[PDB]
Design an enzyme around this catalytic site. Structure first.
Site, PDB file in Angstrom:
ATOM      1  N   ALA A   1       2.770   7.656   3.740  1.00 41.73           N
ATOM      2  CA  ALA A   1       3.701   6.545   3.863  1.00 41.73           C
ATOM      3  C   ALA A   1       3.385   5.385   2.937  1.00 41.73           C
ATOM      4  O   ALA A   1       2.285   5.304   2.394  1.00 41.73           O
ATOM      5  CB  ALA A   1       3.706   6.061   5.314  1.00 41.73           C
TER       6      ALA A   1
ATOM      7  N   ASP B   1     -10.572  10.344   9.066  1.00 40.14           N
ATOM      8  CA  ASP B   1     -10.480   9.959   7.661  1.00 40.14           C
ATOM      9  C   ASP B   1     -10.997   8.554   7.564  1.00 40.14           C
ATOM     10  O   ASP B   1     -10.332   7.663   7.034  1.00 40.14           O
ATOM     11  CB  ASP B   1      -9.045  10.101   7.079  1.00 40.14           C
TER      12      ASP B   1
ATOM     13  N   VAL C   1       3.374   1.050   2.758  1.00 39.15           N
ATOM     14  CA  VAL C   1       3.201  -0.090   3.657  1.00 39.15           C
ATOM     15  C   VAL C   1       3.746  -1.337   2.975  1.00 39.15           C
ATOM     16  O   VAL C   1       3.421  -1.606   1.832  1.00 39.15           O
ATOM     17  CB  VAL C   1       1.765  -0.272   4.203  1.00 39.15           C
TER      18      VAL C   1
ATOM     19  N   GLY D   1       0.787  -1.229   0.000  1.00 32.62           N
ATOM     20  CA  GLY D   1       0.000   0.000   0.000  1.00 32.62           C
ATOM     21  C   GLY D   1       0.809   1.263   0.000  1.00 32.62           C
ATOM     22  O   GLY D   1       1.989   1.249   0.347  1.00 32.62           O
ATOM     23  N   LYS D   2       0.169   2.361  -0.418  1.00 30.63           N
ATOM     24  CA  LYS D   2       0.760   3.699  -0.486  1.00 30.63           C
ATOM     25  C   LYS D   2      -0.331   4.703  -0.068  1.00 30.63           C
ATOM     26  O   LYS D   2      -1.329   4.863  -0.774  1.00 30.63           O
ATOM     27  CB  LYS D   2       1.239   3.974  -1.930  1.00 30.63           C
ATOM     28  N   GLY D   3      -0.160   5.296   1.111  1.00 32.39           N
ATOM     29  CA  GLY D   3      -1.064   6.302   1.654  1.00 32.39           C
ATOM     30  C   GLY D   3      -0.600   7.689   1.266  1.00 32.39           C
ATOM     31  O   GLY D   3       0.305   7.827   0.433  1.00 32.39           O
TER      32      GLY D   3
END
Length: 298
Positions: free
Chosen positions: A17, A136, A19, A12-14
């Site tokens: 950051a 969020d 993950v 993942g990519k927020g």
């Protein structure tokens, strides 16, 4: 001093950051590593401070292991090491799977319990604790555990309702979050800043949209359509606050609940609960605790 960790796969990519699924050398344990660049140090500190609180510990809140500072060749990274939930986020889970009534009941109750816990001024055992507002909340931010219960995890925009919070400090954050899940008072810039807990009501609205997404993919309604995010066909892929306000505020628009869903007595109680939760008036919404009680009744 650093844990023996080998990074495996980018999962993942927020906004702040990346993950990674990783291996923690013990034999090995599978863990998730959240990696912040130096530039997002403030988001790393916010999450670390939230996760570091011994009172946060709950079955529906992601398990925290440790925070680390890691020097690289071309700089430094800030790591958060947490439990890994192989099923991934709820949005992808719902996209790929049609769920049962038992699954809905488990996911829905665990989400409400996790949120009621975040908002509470006490731990489940009665010890005083810092209330937290997620800010969020969305299906893409909720993890699905192996036993098909929800797990809250992404605290980069979260707010600890600290008594030292100023009215000017509460407005300093601005319109934070994902526009699609923003409550009508958030879209309107009409948040009652004289009282923190107006923040709790914004989490309850976002939770109501998530409960809708879960319900929309539950076989108990009979005929199930393909997964679509709330207001999926009414706005662009990454909607601006203005196009969301046209729908949620001006058109009083909410995701569609077809009448046939109410044929099942369980889906009916769920749909009635989430409808009170997305009311235009934040004061007319149920609390996350009210929602958890309704699920504990079902």
């Amino acid at each position: 001093e650093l844990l023996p960790i080998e990074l495996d796969t980018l999962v993942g990519k927020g906004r702040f950051a990346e993950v990674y699924k990783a291996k923690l050398k013990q034999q090995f344990e599978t863990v998730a590593v959240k990696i912040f660049p130096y530039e997002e140090y403030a988001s790393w500190k916010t999450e670390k401070d939230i996760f570091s609180d011994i009172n946060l510990k709950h079955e529906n809140i992601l398990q925290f292991l440790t925070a680390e500072e890691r020097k690289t060749e071309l700089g430094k990274q800030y790591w958060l090491i947490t439990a890994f939930h192989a099923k991934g986020n709820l949005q992808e889970y719902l996209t790929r799977h049609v769920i049962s009534w038992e699954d809905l009941r488990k996911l829905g109750s665990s989400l409400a319990r996790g949120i009621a816990h975040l908002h509470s001024d006490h731990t489940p055992c009665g010890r005083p604790k810092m209330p937290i507002v997620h800010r969020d909340l969305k299906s893409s931010n909720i993890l699905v555990k192996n036993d098909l219960t929800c797990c809250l995890c992404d605290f980069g925009l979260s707010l600890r309702l600290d008594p030292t919070l100023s009215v000017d400090d509460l407005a300093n954050s601005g319109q934070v979050g994902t526009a699609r899940y923003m409550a009508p008072e958030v879209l309107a810039s009409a948040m009652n800043l004289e009282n923190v807990e107006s923040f709790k009501q914004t989490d309850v609205y976002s939770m109501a949209l998530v409960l809708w997404e879960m319900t929309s993919r539950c076989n108990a309604v009979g005929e199930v359509k393909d997964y679509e995010p709330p207001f999926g066909s009414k706005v662009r892929e990454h909607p601006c606050v203005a196009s969301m306000a046209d729908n949620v505020l001006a058109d009083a628009g909410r995701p569609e609940i077809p009448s046939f869903w109410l044929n099942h007595q369980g889906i009916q109680m769920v749909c009635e609960t989430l409808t009170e939760c997305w009311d235009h008036d934040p004061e007319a919404r149920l609390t996350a605790q009210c929602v958890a009680e309704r699920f504990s009744e079902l």
